[PDB]
Amino acid sequence: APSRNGMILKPHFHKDWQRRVATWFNQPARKIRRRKARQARARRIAPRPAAGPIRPIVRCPTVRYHTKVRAGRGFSLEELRVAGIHKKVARTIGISVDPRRRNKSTESLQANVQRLKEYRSKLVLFPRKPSAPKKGDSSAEELKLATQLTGPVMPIRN
Amino acid sequence: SSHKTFRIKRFLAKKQKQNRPIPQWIWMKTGNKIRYNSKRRHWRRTKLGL
Amino acid sequence: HRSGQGAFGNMCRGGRMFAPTKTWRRWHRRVNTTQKRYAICSALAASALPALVMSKGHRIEEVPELPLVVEDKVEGYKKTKEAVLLLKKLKAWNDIKKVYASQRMRAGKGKMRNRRRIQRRGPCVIYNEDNGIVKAFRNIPGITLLNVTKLNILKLAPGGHVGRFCIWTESAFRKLDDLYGTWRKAASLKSNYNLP
Amino acid sequence: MKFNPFVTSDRSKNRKRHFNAPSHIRRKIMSSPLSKELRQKYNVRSMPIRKDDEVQVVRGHYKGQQIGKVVQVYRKKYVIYIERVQREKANGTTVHVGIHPSKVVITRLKLDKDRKKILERKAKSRQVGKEKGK
Amino acid sequence: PFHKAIRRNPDTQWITKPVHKHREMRGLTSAGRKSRGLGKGHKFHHTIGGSRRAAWRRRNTLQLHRYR
Amino acid sequence: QTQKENLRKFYKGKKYKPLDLRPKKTRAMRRRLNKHEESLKTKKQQRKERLYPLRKYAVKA
Amino acid sequence: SAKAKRRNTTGTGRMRHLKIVYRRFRHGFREGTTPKPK
RNA sequence: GCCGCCGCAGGUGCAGAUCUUGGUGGUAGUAGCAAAUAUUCAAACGAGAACUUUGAAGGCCGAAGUGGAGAAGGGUUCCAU
RNA sequence: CGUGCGAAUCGGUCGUCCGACCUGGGUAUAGGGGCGAAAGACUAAUCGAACCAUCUAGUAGCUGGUUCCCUCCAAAGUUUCC
RNA sequence: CGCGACCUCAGAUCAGACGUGGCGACCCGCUGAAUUUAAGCAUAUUAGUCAGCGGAGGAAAAGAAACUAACCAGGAUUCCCUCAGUAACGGCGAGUGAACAGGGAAGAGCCCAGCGCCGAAUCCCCGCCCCGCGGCGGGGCGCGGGAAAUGUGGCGUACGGAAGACCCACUCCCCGGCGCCGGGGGGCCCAAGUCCUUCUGAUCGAGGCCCAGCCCGUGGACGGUGUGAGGCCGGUAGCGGCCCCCGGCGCGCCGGGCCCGGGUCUUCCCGGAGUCGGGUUGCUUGGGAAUGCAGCCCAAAGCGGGUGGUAAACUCCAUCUAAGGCUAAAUACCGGCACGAGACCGAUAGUCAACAAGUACCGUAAGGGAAAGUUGAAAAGAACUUUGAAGAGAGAGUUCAAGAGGGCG
Secondary structure, three states: OOOOOOOOOOOOOOOOOOOOEEEOOOHHHHHHHHHHHHHHHHHHHHOOOOOOOOOOOEEOOOOHHHHOOOEOEEEEEHHHHHHHOOOOHHOOOOOOOOOOOOOOOOHHHHHHHHHHHHHHEEEEEEOOOOOOOOOOOOOHHHHHHOOOOOOOOOOOOO | OOOOHHHHHHHHHHHHHHHOOOOOOOOOOOOOOOOOOOOOOOOOOOOOOO | OOOOOOOOOOOOOOOOOOOOOOOOOOOOOOOHHHHHHEEEEEHHHHHOOOHHHHHHHHOOOOOOOOEEEOOHHHHHOOOOHHHHHHHHHHOOOHHHHHHHHHOOOOOOOOOOOOEEEOOOOOOEEEEOOOOOHHHHHHHOOOOEEEEOOOOOOHHOOOOOOOOEEEEEEHHHHHHHHHHHOEEEEEEEEOOOOOOO | OOOOOOOOHHHHHHHHHHOOOOOOHHHHHHHHHHHHHHHHHHHEEEOOOOOOOEEOOOOOOOOOOOOOEEEEOOOOOOOEEEEEEEEOOOOEEEEEEOOOOOOOEEEEOOOOOHHHHHHHHHHHHHHHHHHHHH | OOOHHOOOOOOHHOOOOOOOOOOHHHOOHHHHHHHHHOEEEEEEEEOOOOHHHHHHHHOOEEOOOOOO | OOHHHHHHHOOOOOOOOOOOOOOOHHHHHHHOOHHHHOOOHHHOOOOHHHOOOOOOOOOOO | HHHHHHHHOOOOOOOHHHHHHHHHHOOOOOOOOOOOOO
């Protein structure tokens, strides 16, 4: 007995959906598991921050959303060439490096070079051995002033 | 079968030892839930499966 | 013995019961945030309303005059005998003696389902920071210790009965003015909420 | 209060662990408190029971100040049999009446090296628990 | 897999793993991947996720939340 | 027991031994590689670990 | 044959090797050691 | 071990469905203990003998038997107390 | 007899009985298939398509039933279509 | 005929290593029917559906571009949300039906064929002795042999690499034992009343315990104890106490292999085949002048080729280069190993099975499949007399009561 004027739909319940049932039982359990995994990772990497490697400034496609700034994968080859630091040396100090990304914007090129200069100014490098320092190391005061930055390091703001 | 076997004969020999009921000392103890032997067999009643 | 019994159906022996229970039933109910705001509100004005305390059944005669706020040295106590001495100096012992007296037994199926012992709910106490107050007050039942900002509606209204008395501290009594404030001024610690 | 989730707090599970238990656990369950003088002297709250130990009846009908020796220990019902606790069957003989070991005051313990080891362990635990509190 | 000259080589230690037993039976080799048909492009929207069966399972299921 | 400890003390020094004296365990723990074979790293991997190891670093506040 | 699966299960028989496999797994697979004597 | 009161929740209200299981009646001390000839006396262990024991008499099956032995099948069904 | 001794027995009673005679054991032929001196005849007390389990809680404009109280309001067997 | 080898193919109780199969909740690759919906029914839908075959793991699948894409662009994989049930498919009817976009768990990269530089400059097995190993590890000796030039060791993978020349400055790279330096597992024990009056069956019951409103509380969770116990006991609390064992992480020691780099100019080198693709025919998808696979035929191009959601001709530009491969991360668990919890049920209910339950039992078989709790706190289970062959009665005894009499709430 169909009723009066109203909306119409296609209720996809003709199949045996009681066989394939996957409801959300472990939402807070998965949240506590991710929390404990993140705390275990933060206790694993002691000098390293929670975010780790920094992310470049990324322009957007899809002209509905072209007035945004994203955080992509890593820095580009021309960016590392203008920065001057070799990529195999910069990978060891925790910098996201990928040769696949393109470069079609001099403004974001200069912005990523400025981001790398800010990371170089904020960089604190530890010695290889705590008993004996080496040549390319920082002062002893910065080793004590260095700590875990809780949060994303140098966040992108509009 | 008048021509008797070897393995089924030992099976029947084990059933003849299982045929005997419970003793008298088993219910004299503390824990006595068994009143009598339930798993019994009779040669006219039970035809031994098969 | 089971031969032509027909055990299927709800009317027969076993088989299935009518309307089997659902794991995908909507057990939980979501609540809007602004409704939780008004649920947290309208509590202190009713707990101070002294008639609701007598309607609940607490001994209100022992407190002469205070919506009870004690000094900051309460968290410094770490002994149950010091807690009993503080309750005797504040004279609030009859409300917990009523809890020790009312030790009736539950009538139902909850006796074999780990819900046997029941008792009377006492007054709540709100602390600000831990200084050994939990290690002292975890043994004595009835007195529930809560946080200043983190409050629950279920503990403020046990069983839909508003009137349960709440003991505060000096730091919490100063922190409530920083949290809520007044009608025209919004919350400083929170983002934006005005009093109605 | 309890704050350990491994601790069993189920009524049927405690009633299962009370009855169903092997012999060394049943022997440790069967215990009795000491007297007021011996408790103050040894600083021991409670000790297990033995066939050689002496037993007085504390509560019940046939109570008094009679020093009774344990006849034999029956751990299936968690019971002992006291020497001067019995009643007459109608045929003429006498049958001892079993008394639960919780209603037992201790007048004398049969001291052995293994018994003195348990006394020294309980006294050391009592002294450590008193020193950590005071 | 049990020969010593193959076993000592670290370049073939992934071949002798117990996870990779019977690759040719499941069809995870080159011919097994070419017989199904998959790759990269906008025309391939049926191997997203794990595989065709996993994508079909993620399509034809429902998700019921806690508070709804 | 005494004959078995005498036999294992006799055959401990020799390389070859019967299958009963060899340790019986689960299949996934039997069919493995050797401990030195798990430590056999390739020359190019050792060259990469020699040239560029992971450094210890941090950032300022 | 749903009832034929539950007629002849693995839990019906001995599991004389399986129970000592679990009893060695709960220890951690020690291979022929000796306990400490007096 | 249980009741009332303030809110909430249900596997919450039975007379039937040739409804399910279980229990009990009129019937009813009814119908029945009829396929194939046949039994009768003395004593006896035993409290107790139309049915069992021995002693006697009279018969049946009539060698294609109401006889003795086998195979399949049954599995202590054979004997003693 | 026909709520049997019997989920197909017995009495009177026959056709045939040196040859198209019955048959004891082992083996071959199994289900849109087999066998069949041809009767949808038979195939384990079931044969116009054998037994058991699953889809299956298949379909049913069709029958059978569907449980506390009190108060107020208060119906149609038709226009047209398939 | 006679003498020595290369290739094809031979048999094992030759030394030594593998597979067989029970089970499998999750997963991978294939075959994959109709009851039904379309009030009939064949196209469609149910439906890559049950079922069947093969296979290992605590996960598998999975992964670094012949990508999304016409934007001011991003750049390995995975799950969730919006997208929206949106475009579309469909007797355009019923019905079926994705992602690009953005935000979070996530971060690990690369290596081979070819190309060429260096005296196969490359390694295995067996024996001797020495150190040692319930993962026989390394070296010393071996015209003792075999393999491999039909191609082995490093450099070496698309982001360019290498060599020559020119400047700079550097000393650590991992592994095996020894001794120090402070998370886990198995155990063992730790407080306060049996204080007074009284009741019955015992009290765990009622009253009081002062001016100390009896006592302890980093212990009033839980259970038993002749009725409803914080103080009778087991145990509870403790980053508390005691014993044993393992590894993790920071320092010293010798021992094994181990001397290998950044910038500028010039020259050579460079790509993976009967594979793409075209004609024809089925399967399947939302995929629709074809999204992909497969059966037959043809089958290349190397400023070469795939795609640019409309087929075919004339063109400009944007994308990386299928035809070689590895890789943990968030993802699933209905069976098993250890537990905890519950607004679930309470002996015809709950797993069919709370007990010697797939047990007894039935069928020639694949198979089917039950009925079943509440003595007394404590057996103190009835001694003694009589009737009677014994069964079965009539007086006594226990206990608070037989008003609890061996199938006894």
